[PDB]
Structure 1
Amino acid sequence: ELPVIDAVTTHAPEVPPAIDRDYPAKVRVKMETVEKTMKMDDGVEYRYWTFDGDVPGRMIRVREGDTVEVEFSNNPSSTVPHNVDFHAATGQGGGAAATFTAPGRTSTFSFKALQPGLYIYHCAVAPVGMHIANGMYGLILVEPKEGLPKVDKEFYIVQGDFYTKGKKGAQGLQPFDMDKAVAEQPEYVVFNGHVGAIAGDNALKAKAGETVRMYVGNGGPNLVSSFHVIGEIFDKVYVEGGKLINENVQSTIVPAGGSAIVEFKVDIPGNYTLVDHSIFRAFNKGALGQLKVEGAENPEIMTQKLSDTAY
């Protein structure tokens, strides 16, 4: 039958390596759900529900035609059951029924990855919106049979909207707020679970001259992202994460429960800012990340300020 291979899965913002196999395999993935309290912002704590200890879950990377076998464990300290719906999976609930797992239990199931693409996976236990809004989502990349083109740098980015009882900035442990969630009025909108998770000392890094690809998911639960990198243009966009390629795009829509792949070349050093360009989200609710690029200046691409005079 098919050979068995253990999956390499990565914590955001890292991405598993490209697959060098030209035949189908049974790829074994282990996942654990963990409820834990973490910092959403300075002085603000939140009780996240997570795949494997953070938001988003770890990235999976398989090849079209693979069978994906999932061993799904719910930590005994969890208060509720959890499960997983893979948008990459064809069949009931994307796997949700087969993976329904009470605290302190393990479920196993498998599915065939019939189509390439970049797929959200998320918990689907009722009330589904709360399980997602507490942070239970990630991406699985299903490569085309021939692979994707080579790039220098790859990053794993997932946007989410969060609903707290207090206003943004209100200190302490902030509970989930169902009324704000139903009204689609989030207090925080973030990349990778937390304000500053990929900014500042957590900034992404590259060098001038390098090609960059970002695997961008939107776990929602509710918002649609107008995704943009300040100071860059997307040379290529895989539209809605599908096969169709657009070029020379400044800002691209990432549907709720959907994805996009964007590619660009960083030509000169600087700090490049990832945003949701519904711009009060970025500068007032947290939807802001950084890519720091080192290397040599090149005035032919962009200069510093050349003069300052009276007007």
Structure 2
Amino acid sequence: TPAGELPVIDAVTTHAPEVPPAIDRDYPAKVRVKMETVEKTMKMDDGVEYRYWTFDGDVPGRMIRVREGDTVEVEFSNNPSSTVPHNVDFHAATGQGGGAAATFTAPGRTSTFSFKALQPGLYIYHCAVAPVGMHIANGMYGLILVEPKEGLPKVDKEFYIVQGDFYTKGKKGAQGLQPFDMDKAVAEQPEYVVFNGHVGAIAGDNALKAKAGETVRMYVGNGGPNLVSSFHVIGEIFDKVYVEGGKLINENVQSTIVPAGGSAIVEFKVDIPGNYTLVDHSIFRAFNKGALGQLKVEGAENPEIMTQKLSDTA
């Protein structure tokens, strides 16, 4: 069926950690997506600035949500102030470079192309301009969720989380604007490992929020470029894991691998209030390089699941 004969729907995309609403369609549609590539200076950590290359102004790019069988029409613009061309490779797309050749766009230009989402899953998209590693390492990646035809189960809370490793010339903590360091990248020796582009992006005042009793689903991406994440939530167990973001489901998992350029979906029920910490359990990444997020859960205590310190004695 030609895509021009399908009803046209403007995509609802979200900035991390938000997720677009679930799709209540039982028929294919032509989904129009607008993306802009912007090079901009942002805060990586306290007193540390970095020149990010972004989809739509932050890291990761905005999340896209479509249904298996949809045609995705992408209007791809590269901001005039950009120093280099950019494009996008959708791991959800079947064909040359996942769309990279069709979306090769110089600064001040706009490209359009479309692809059919043939297979459900949770797919990384990222820039593929040479040198690809640099474009990825500077923050050009995001997730597109392709729902199964029948949809996914309903859950109370959904979060959008993408891990990435960053390579600065100075050591972590070195102040000022820090340029990209190709040698550390080739050596796979990052200074920062973060969720959603920046240290503390989903921690402290920016923590994720939920209420006791709610079911939580996390769409977890790994833009890399290099590291593989042992993803874990302190204080919780994964009721379900879509292994490597695929169809296969594992259960009762404490820590699951997220491949580089890959993904995973994890689900768990937050039973009792508390502060839950997302980490890459290659643990020195979490507590020394920034691979640390927080989930605030409010509600009524339940001693039957866990008690506090009942006593301390000599």
Length-normalised TM-score, structure 1? 0.99
Q: Which residue of 2 aligns with 1:22?
A: 26
Q: Which residue of 1 aligns with 2:181?
A: 177
Q: Does 1:103 align with 2:107?
A: yes
Distance 1:2 1:296 in 2: 48
List gaps (5 residues or longer) in structure 1.
none
Deviations 1:23-70 (A, max 9, x none): 101000000000000000000000000000000000000000000000
Please tell me the root mean square deviation across aligned C-alpha atoms, in Å.
0.3
Distance 1:275 1:255 in 2: 15
- Quick one: which of 192, 197, 202 aligns to 1:193? 197
Distance 2:46 2:103 in 1: 36
Deviations 1:165-216 (A, max 9, x none): 0000000000000000000000000000000000001000000000000000
Q: CA deviation at 1:267?
A: 0.3
Deviations 1:134-165 (A, max 9, x none): 00000000000000000000000000000000
Deviations 1:227-249 (A, max 9, x none): 00000000000000000000000
Q: Which residue of 2 aligns with 1:5?
A: 9
Q: CA deviation at 1:309?
A: 1.0
Distance 1:294 1:186 in 2: 35
Regions of 4+ moved over 2 Å: none
Q: CA deviation at 1:308?
A: 1.1
Query: Which SS does the other structure have where 2:135 is aligned?
Result: helix
Q: CA deviation at 1:124?
A: 0.2
Distance 1:306 1:46 in 2: 47
Query: Which SS does the other structure have where 2:227 is aligned?
Result: coil
Distance 1:170 1:283 in 2: 17
Distance 2:149 2:22 in 1: 12
Q: CA deviation at 1:102?
A: 0.3
Query: Which SS does the other structure have where 1:181 is aligned?
Result: helix
Q: CA deviation at 1:276?
A: 0.1
Distance 1:47 1:69 in 2: 29
Q: Which residue of 2 aligns with 1:293?
A: 297
Distance 1:166 1:5 in 2: 46
Deviations 1:97-116 (A, max 9, x none): 00000000000000000000
Aligned residues: 310
Distance 2:312 2:27 in 1: 62
Q: Which residue of 1 aligns with 2:241?
A: 237
Deviations 1:76-108 (A, max 9, x none): 000000000000000000000000000000000
Q: Please show how residues 137-286 of structure 1 align to structure 2 within 5 Å.
A: 137-286=141-290
Deviations 1:275-298 (A, max 9, x none): 000000000000000000000000
**Percent sequence identity over aligned pairs:** 100
Query: Which SS does the other structure have where 1:80 is aligned?
Result: coil
Distance 2:173 2:8 in 1: 48
Distance 1:2 1:206 in 2: 37
Distance 1:256 1:123 in 2: 15
Distance 2:208 2:132 in 1: 32
Distance 2:14 2:238 in 1: 25
Q: Does 1:92 align with 2:96?
A: yes
Query: Which SS does the other structure have where 1:23 is aligned?
Result: coil
Length-normalised TM-score, structure 2? 0.99
Query: Which SS does the other structure have where 1:201 is aligned?
Result: helix
Distance 2:272 2:121 in 1: 31
Distance 1:243 1:154 in 2: 18
Query: Which SS does the other structure have where 1:28 is aligned?
Result: strand
Query: Which SS does the other structure have where 1:121 is aligned?
Result: strand
